[PDB]
């Protein structure tokens, strides 16, 4: 009587290159029975609407079925000089002592990259500036990219809880050299970067 439930997405992020006709994201049903699926796109704040449509927005997956979702920009007035982050979310719903059931929502960053924003975050991730005062660690991102940091350490001590750093933005979290990696456009981690102080 354990209830198990999962949904599989083909990637952990989707990079939406401005010049393209659209992006895709695979979704699979690991269950040996049919599930209902809803896909939506929300703005960076996880609540506001975003100028994207996912097709189909509503579908049923058979047992073990794998499908593709198409994601297309539909208008909007996104900036041209920096990335804009959205979230693409997949809601999965199973069919109907305890009677235990679950529904789940898996959301990926959907990162919009204007055509004039060239290269990748990892190309310029060595331009992050770090400042340490007392217990406060601040990271400054002077680049047009979202900087999705992983495996951050300070004097070898793991730092957990630095949020992703938006374009032209800083983050501050409550000693010694900093080391970090970024999660790449393709989901793995970059080579390490270092900053001395």
């Amino acid at each position: 009587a354990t209830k198990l439930f999962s949904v599989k997405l083909g990637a952990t992020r989707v990079i939406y290159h401005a010049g393209t006709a659209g992006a895709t994201l695979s979704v699979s049903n690991p269950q040996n029975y049919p599930i209902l699926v809803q896909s939506s796109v929300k703005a960076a704040d996880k609540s506001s609407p975003a100028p994207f449509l996912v097709m189909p927005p509503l579908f049923r997956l058979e047992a073990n079925q794998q499908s593709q979702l198409r994601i297309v920009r539909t208008g909007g007035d996104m900036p041209t000089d920096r990335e804009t982050l959205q979230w693409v979310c997949i809601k999965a719903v199973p069919p109907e002592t305890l009677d235990l059931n679950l529904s789940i929502n898996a959301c990926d960053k959907l990162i919009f990259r204007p055509d004039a924003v060239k290269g990748t975050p990892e190309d310029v991730a060595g331009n992050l500036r770090w400042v340490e005062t007392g217990n406060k660690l601040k990271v400054e991102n002077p680049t047009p990219f979202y900087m999705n940091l992983a495996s951050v350490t300070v004097g070898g001590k793991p730092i957990t809880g630095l949020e992703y750093v938006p374009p032209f933005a800083d983050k501050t979290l409550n000693h010694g050299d900093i080391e970090w990696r970024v999660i790449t456009d393709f989901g793995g981690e970059s080579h390490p970067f270092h900053y001395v102080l």
């Binding site: 009587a1 354990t2 209830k3 198990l4 439930f5 999962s6 949904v7 599989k8 997405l9 952990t12 992020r13 690991p30 929300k42 996880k46 609540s47 979230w87 979310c89 002592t97 305890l98 009677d99 235990l100 059931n101 679950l102 529904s103 789940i104 929502n105 898996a106 959301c107 990926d108 960053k109 999705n148 992983a150 957990t160 992703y164 999660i183 989901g187």
Partner: protein, 112 residues
Amino acid sequence: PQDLTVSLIPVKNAPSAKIAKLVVNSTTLKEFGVRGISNNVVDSTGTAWRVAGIGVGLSSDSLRRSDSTEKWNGVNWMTFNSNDTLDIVLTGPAQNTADTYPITLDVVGYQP
């Protein structure tokens, strides 16, 4: 496995008697949100609610482990460290019916 896998495992009743166990697994998630789904929900965050064949909800020890409360898409969610196990209890004082009771949890994860 980056993908979310969620397990809900069954465990006059004892005060705060444990009735189910929630495990959320992913190698990439940092945190998840969870709410109970009911016709009769008994707070902003959906962490205590009534179930028709009893008062159920997260234990005080599980609630203690919440990282934050976030408003996402119009609704408050308590967030928890991924790979955590949370306990679902009969809430309040000792509660007294031979029946099957439906418990529904909704889980969300935003991938780093």
